[PDB]
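ERR on first pass: missing label on line 2. Operator R.T. fixed the label and resubmitted. Corrected input:
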Amino acid sequence: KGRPGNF
Amino acid sequence: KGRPGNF
Amino acid sequence: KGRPGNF
Amino acid sequence: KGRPGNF
Amino acid sequence: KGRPGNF
Amino acid sequence: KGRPGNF
Amino acid sequence: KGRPGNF
Amino acid sequence: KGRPGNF
Amino acid sequence: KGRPGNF
Amino acid sequence: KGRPGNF
Amino acid sequence: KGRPGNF
Amino acid sequence: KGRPGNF
Amino acid sequence: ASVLSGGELDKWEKIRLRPGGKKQYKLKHIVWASRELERFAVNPGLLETSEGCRQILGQLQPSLQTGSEELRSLYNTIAVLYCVHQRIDVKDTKEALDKIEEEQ
Amino acid sequence: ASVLSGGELDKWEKIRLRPGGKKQYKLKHIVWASRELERFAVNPGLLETSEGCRQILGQLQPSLQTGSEELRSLYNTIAVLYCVHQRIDVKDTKEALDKIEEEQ
Amino acid sequence: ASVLSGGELDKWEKIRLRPGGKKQYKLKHIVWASRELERFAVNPGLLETSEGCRQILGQLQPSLQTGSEELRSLYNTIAVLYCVHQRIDVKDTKEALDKIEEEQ
Amino acid sequence: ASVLSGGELDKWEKIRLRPGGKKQYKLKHIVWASRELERFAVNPGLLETSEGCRQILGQLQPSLQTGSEELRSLYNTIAVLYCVHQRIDVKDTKEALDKIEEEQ
Amino acid sequence: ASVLSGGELDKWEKIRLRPGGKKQYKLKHIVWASRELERFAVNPGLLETSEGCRQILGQLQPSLQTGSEELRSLYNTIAVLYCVHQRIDVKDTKEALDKIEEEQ
Amino acid sequence: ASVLSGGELDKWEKIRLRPGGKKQYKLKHIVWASRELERFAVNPGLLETSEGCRQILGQLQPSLQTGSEELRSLYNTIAVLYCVHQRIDVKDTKEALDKIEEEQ
Amino acid sequence: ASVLSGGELDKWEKIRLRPGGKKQYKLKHIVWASRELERFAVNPGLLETSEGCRQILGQLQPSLQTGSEELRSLYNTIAVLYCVHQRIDVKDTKEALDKIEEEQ
Amino acid sequence: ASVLSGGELDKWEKIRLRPGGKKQYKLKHIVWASRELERFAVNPGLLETSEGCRQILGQLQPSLQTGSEELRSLYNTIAVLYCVHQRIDVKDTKEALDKIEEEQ
Amino acid sequence: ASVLSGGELDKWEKIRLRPGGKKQYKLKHIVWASRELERFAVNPGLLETSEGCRQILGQLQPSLQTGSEELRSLYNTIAVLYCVHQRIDVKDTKEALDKIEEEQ
Amino acid sequence: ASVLSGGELDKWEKIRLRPGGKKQYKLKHIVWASRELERFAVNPGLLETSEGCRQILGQLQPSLQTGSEELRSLYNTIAVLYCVHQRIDVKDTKEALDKIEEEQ
Amino acid sequence: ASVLSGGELDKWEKIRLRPGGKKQYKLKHIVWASRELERFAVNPGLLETSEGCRQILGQLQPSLQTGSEELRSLYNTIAVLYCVHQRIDVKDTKEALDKIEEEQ
Amino acid sequence: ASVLSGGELDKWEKIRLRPGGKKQYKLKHIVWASRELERFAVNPGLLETSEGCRQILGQLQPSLQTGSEELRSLYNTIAVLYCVHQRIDVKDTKEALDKIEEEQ
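pass 2 clean. output:
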């Protein structure tokens, strides 16, 4: 997908 | 002629 | 014509 | 679709 | 005719 | 041309 | 698309 | 033409 | 063209 | 000649 | 030459 | 030419 | 390009020439009047307004006392046309003339 | 259907056009005057009475100052015809004009 | 036998019909005016003097309010010819009319 | 996509170019005016409202004193179109100009 | 991995959609609600607790006034699911909504 | 099943997108707006009343500050449609926006 | 012989035409503006300095109220070019116009 | 149909373009000026009088500050032509401009 | 057309996703964030300025309490990008969030 | 062995001969000026310093009142070269002359 | 393109070079003087006016004390030409010089 | 026809060009000076007297400050020739210049 593991 | 008998 | 020399 | 007639 | 456009 | 004689 | 150039 | 959609 | 070098 | 049109 | 004997 | 080195 | 509308023409054709007479006015009498005004070098476009008719009458009036049959006929026709443009329900030329005289 | 009677015509033909002149008036000058009045749209029947002649003169008079040869000739002819209808024994047009001016 | 001299004609031809217009006056407009005055039975010889032009104007003036295109054209032409005979350096008919109105 | 409605166009076509003239206004004069405003880079859409006509007139007015025949013709046409949009029953361009001058 | 236990589901299936209606709620309505919350990008895991249901309702509420049929259906379904998690023995959606409104 | 009547549509098509522009509004812009409101899950039936348009505007307004081209286009279209339903004779989108801002 | 340096051009190309829009300015818009100023007979060499841009704007400004699309486009382009020569970090034409209006 | 007489043209041809220059004025410069005034839609007939030249100058003057080479050339040519019509014995364009500035 | 310069990108790639983690940020996370903002119909051009990032954060913030993994990831990415545009030497997302919270 | 550096030459070539003109200065004008000063037996090496340019100007100045085109051209060229050596950002010869006159 | 008119040339040719001499002035002496002034880089167009002759004399005068035969011949020729332009009926160069000295 | 006598020439040839130099003056330097004075249009016969040399020096002196190599060489040669005619036993050009400066 592309979303970061920010949280 | 065409004039009326107005008078 | 017919006019007189009146004047 | 699946939505209920709630309203 | 001959009349001017004066007016 | 088309312009009127307005003036 | 269809959107107007409103803005 | 070339004019921008500025306005 | 025809314009003078006035200026 | 070469002189400019300065004046 | 052309100059006058003025003086 | 002929000019002196005066200066 | 008649001077009158169809409704004012339908008024006009009813008006009778003489107070007790059988003879009605007709459109040709307006046509003749418009064709006669250019003999006097009056502007025929004034026939289209009540103010223009009043002005033509005011210009013709001093010539009536010695005026020919054609001038009297033109004056009476323009008086009636003035009354039609005022939409006064005059029935004859003498009514039209009295209506105009009352303004004096 | 002449304007004058035979007796007034026998007066008229004697009158001379110019005060010192040899030329007499003629009937054709009355005919011409009656034929000219319809150009001005004046009622030619007024020529038959002294009052009608006075009225025609009063209507023509303001146009004299700039008037053409035809208008001056018509005015002078109607002045003389007025004097004939008054049965004034004028001998020339200048007498006729003085006779009318005296009334003013 | 033109009304104007060659010098006053050389003034006349310069004058333009309308204040902003391109069209000049021409000699034929004087010819037409002289040929039109005999319809009104005005004496055309008055066109030769500034006083005669003033008199013709004074006689035509009351007919302007209802006057036809021909009467308005004749009045404006005779106004300009009056200004030329006064040798006023008017440039257009509206200048000529203002110059004459100032005298009133 | 004419500027006028059919009713205001039926008013417009009646109006005459000169106060005593025979020549009427026509639709092509509106077309020409709309085609001329884009030379001055004025927005031709302002011709559709009485306020827009008043604004165009206010912008053209200072150029009249030295203005060419085309600018004077355009100014007078837009004055008449302003009067038509105000639905003032003006009969000629001079009436239209007086009506607008009265507002000043 | 249903949101409800078998006992609360046996409560849920009894509840009827409209106060006088014959139609019961079904499990698929919970499935649809959980599948719809991800369109609004709301966290679907909040459906598992009464506090989460209260939070989803508090976030959806201001959109109801103009809300589509899908938003109103989702709001009413989550209101009923909140009442089931509170184990309030509501019998219909209007009871569920009144129960929640009483808290305000 | 258009949102507008034929008369209000004949008003709508005249309105131009930009205050000085040549481009008019079209029916397809209303169709697009009605098709876009269902992305935001706003009830498209509110477009049929002036109160509904005011409500949609009040809901879209806080998203304008950061809003995309599509949201700004939808907001301006619904502002103009509100003005058409109020039958305010606005001529452009900036007039429509000023008319709505005056209410605040 | 571009009006801008490569650094100011690299600023210019970033600026977007409308505050929320996707469309950037391009060099051809400066070329068009320089080619349009010679229609108004404005000196195109003034585009090279911030003072010259301020002077062109001061001369174009009174024509905006009725100005065509081309005049409004030229005014907005020269406003943005003035802001680039002042090296104000404006992001859109409305920012550029507000920056210039603040000076008044 | 030259603007100048042969005597004023014999003055004109002597005047030099620049105060120290060798180049004289020529008739073609008047022809060009008369052909250029119709681009600005100024009435070219005003070139024929000293008052008209003063009026054209008063209309061109506010455009000089940003004016193109063609506008500055036209302004200076019309200044010199004004001085020739005043028959001031100016020798160059700078003398002509000083003579006109002294009037302010 | 990346949002960051090469120098700010060389800062960005150093920042680690979690305070103790091994995983760095990458350019694709900015690409994904710019591609995700158009789902919320937020203007993606605001990512280019620190003020735009602050505005996007202020608009996303009230949705965090119930926000999905994608909304929390987008909020944290835009917080870090705001810190990079402020050129604050933050080392992780929790530092970035504390830096932004300190402003409140 | 040019008088100017490449940077001051890149200033010089931009300067235009006449305040509104299209024609730029060129290097050949400096070459011609340096070749002309040896006719007057002035030391051409003074062109290399601002003080030398001021001295040449002070020596040429009293000959200007009657000076030929070549002397006026040389004086104006050396004035501009003085301004370039002072690195004053003059745009034309008249600016250069005003800048020098202000020192008096 | 002689400096003198034919009448002033007919004065000039009478003047004799020396007070008691037989030798007259000739046109070629004016031609030579005009061809010599360009050696001194004086503007030869000043020979056309009495003020220009006075200015040339005022510029040549300080060089007389040590002046060559050519400078003295040019000074005396321009003195006589000044007297001819003043139309003073001088008969010889010594008269011309006394006439000019009297002005000091 | 040398300027000097054989005795003063036998003085002249001894004088050295520079105060410490080996190079003597020569007759050709006087010949060159006499041939150069006619470029400046100075009367070369003044070289024959001490008063004439003083006058030539007084005329050349103001041109020295900017003077070319040829003018400085001519001035120094005529200074030395003045000292020879005064029969001052100067040994070099600097002595000659000091001797002349002492007179000031």
